[PDB]
Write a protein that binds this ligand. Structure first.
Ligand code: NA
Ligand code: NA
Lengths: 389, 389
């Protein structure tokens, strides 16, 4: 099978089958497929001026225009932006910046960054279904955030540079933390004089209904990182957005052609009302319909989501919060059913996740959920037959 | 001062000044500026199919086409290519591959990579002018290579995964190793069961007259890495080329738009005879003329280069091989003169380096060197006038 075409939320193959891309590429095709206007933006920039040499102390006008527009949609205080070619480069750049910041502050010892599972250290993820015991989600959020305080005290605050986290952990199975989590993380970071970094690789550019995930969860990072969601994936790009504290402690970056396409993308997300529509219209619709569709199944639990990112977990016994053995095997079984039915929704372990293009219509939401629901019927029937139910 | 246009080896500013780009952007605009055909390649790919989903078990046709073409210009045995968005990503990917290779081989202790100055370790660079003492270059090449053996023995061979090096160290000042160096490096790597990796960030895509620097020096690495020279910089891209031994060990990618541009670039380099012309024609001319132009100056020594990469070093006393103090200050002085005269040649410490687009004509070589020559005359006079001669 070869892919021949994409438009909106759909991909087409050489056999003429229409496939619903419920993952928007790599969680990043937020304006959807088929933006021929972006092709023109790239063509024009490459015909005119695809380079800009550091010999000149000025900045390529496409990059200037992108930065000016980004400033309008990012939170106040993020006036320094460092462009990269990818999320990976953004993470590397962020790490170097955090460390340099502390060097400049006269604290070169402060070099370790702390992140989460699913000069490095890691803490457990705020996954209540697995780790919550008989705590309420609110109680658990405080406990899970305090794992950061524990790790800071273990390493020593004078050696810790920063905590880095995705507002919602995407690759981890869309683990949505309790409401109490990020405020406690923030208290802990500020208490121990540790920088706070939001990784917006998946939550960026409208995914949660706000422009950035950290805005939805109401925390104020010192920096945040972005990947190719910045261009809806149409060309490789990323960025590190630097807040006032770190900027003060610390011009040429950005491939001009990719910047021109990113500018067209961000302008579309704003001017065509796409992000606002997630917040006001399609987000709440998706979240309601997602929950109406999946909550009833015997082996589905923890149905969850915000804006246009959503998920659930396949489980052996809901009443016991008992997961299937060999976490991942059942998810793969379920994912194969979706794929056989020309629906792209992926599995992380036994979590099923979705992040369709933000432009998805209500009818398209219901179309996707109808296929998914039919697939889950088959999944449940298949479990029974294999004696795994 | 704003850049407004580029064509061939030239850039122009908003005042209409012509600037000679003797560095080809970031050592990478090998086909030159002004390739309007590349804009069309990008437009067409973005109009038709800028994405390709892993849902399909096939590869995007532009990537297939690029790989097929690359296979015709790389050495035998490199039939696995992993595409990235940049040189930096290529290095990261290579490091993960070399470590995974050894894990699969059942030698999980092999994790350290060794490189050179200018989980990681470093050895000294084969810079004869500084380190050669009373050795001939050939004798020094063997000694400098044996620094790798000394380092491997210090660490423990069973802990060492790979040695990584640029065939000619570009950012280090175009340090061209003696003829004896790379064969001894290779021998040592084989002796200690260490992988050999060539970093083609600057030597790649025709810079030395061969397609790749490792070919010029006659060694066969197990992997090699490339950066955006693969597209002459027109879009972000990189790659890791994986040899048979490693590819098979692992068995036991690519943004389609960037791939389409890279394919146009490689096709041009080949079909327009650009690389062949470096080997047979412009390279030998550049090297001769570079040496004729610079060798006579009292404070210039170690005039060097291969193909279309060349350099020299500003020195306090040639007879004594005595460098200026505060290495870098004099290079900056000289570079500033170049820039004032609208010539882009850069300084790496007190090394002056050049790597112009490969399409430079003989007339353009002479034009560039005539400017550089006048700048060196000024440099010598300013040195005397400052009492630094
Ligand atoms: Na802002
Ligand atoms: Na080959």
């Amino acid at each position: 099978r070869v892919m021949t075409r994409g438009e909106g939320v759909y991909l087409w193959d050489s056999e003429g089958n229409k496939i619903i891309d419920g993952m928007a590429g790599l969680w990043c095709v937020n304006v959807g497929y088929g933006r021929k206007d972006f092709a023109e933006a790239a063509r024009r920039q490459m015909e005119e001026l695809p380079f800009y040499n550091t010999f000149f102390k000025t900045t390529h006008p496409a990059v200037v225009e992108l930065s000016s527009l980004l400033a309008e949609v990012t939170p106040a205080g993020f006036d320094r932006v460092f462009y990269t070619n990818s999320g990976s480069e953004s993470v590397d750049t962020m790490i170097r910046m955090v460390r340099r910041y502390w060097d400049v502050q006269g604290k070169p010892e402060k070099k370790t960054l702390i992140g989460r599972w699913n000069g490095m250290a890691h803490i457990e993820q705020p996954w209540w279904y697995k780790h919550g015991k008989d705590m309420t989600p609110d109680e658990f959020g405080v406990v899970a955030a305090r794992w950061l305080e524990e790790k800071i005290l273990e390493i020593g605050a004078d050696k810790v540079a920063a905590f880095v986290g995705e507002p919602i952990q995407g690759a981890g199975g869309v683990i949505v933390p309790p409401a109490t989590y990020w405020p406690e993380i923030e208290r802990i970071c500020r208490k121990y004089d540790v920088l706070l970094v939001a990784d917006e690789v998946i939550c960026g550019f409208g995914r949660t209904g706000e422009w950035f995930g950290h805005q939805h969860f109401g925390f104020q990072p010192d920096l945040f990182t972005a990947a190719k969601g910045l261009s809806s994936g149409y060309l490789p790009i990323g960025a590190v957005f630097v807040g006032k504290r770190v900027a003060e402690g610390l011009t040429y970056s950005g491939h001009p052609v990719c910047a021109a396409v990113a500018h067209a993308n961000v302008a579309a997300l704003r001017d065509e009302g796409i992000v606002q529509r997630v917040k006001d219209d399609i987000g709440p619709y998706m979240q309601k319909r997602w929950r109406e569709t999946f909550s009833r199944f015997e082996h589905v639990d923890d149905v969850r989501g915000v804006g246009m990112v959503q998920a659930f977990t396949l489980v052996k016994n809901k009443a016991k919060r008992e997961l299937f053995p060999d976490f991942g095997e059942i998810g793969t079984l379920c994912r194969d059913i979706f794929f056989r039915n020309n629906l792209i929704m992926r599995a992380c372990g036994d979590h099923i996740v979705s992040a369709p293009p933000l432009v998805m219509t209500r009818a398209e939401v219901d179309e996707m959920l109808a296929v998914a629901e039919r697939c889950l019927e088959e999944f449940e029937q298949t479990l029974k037959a294999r004696g795994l139910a």
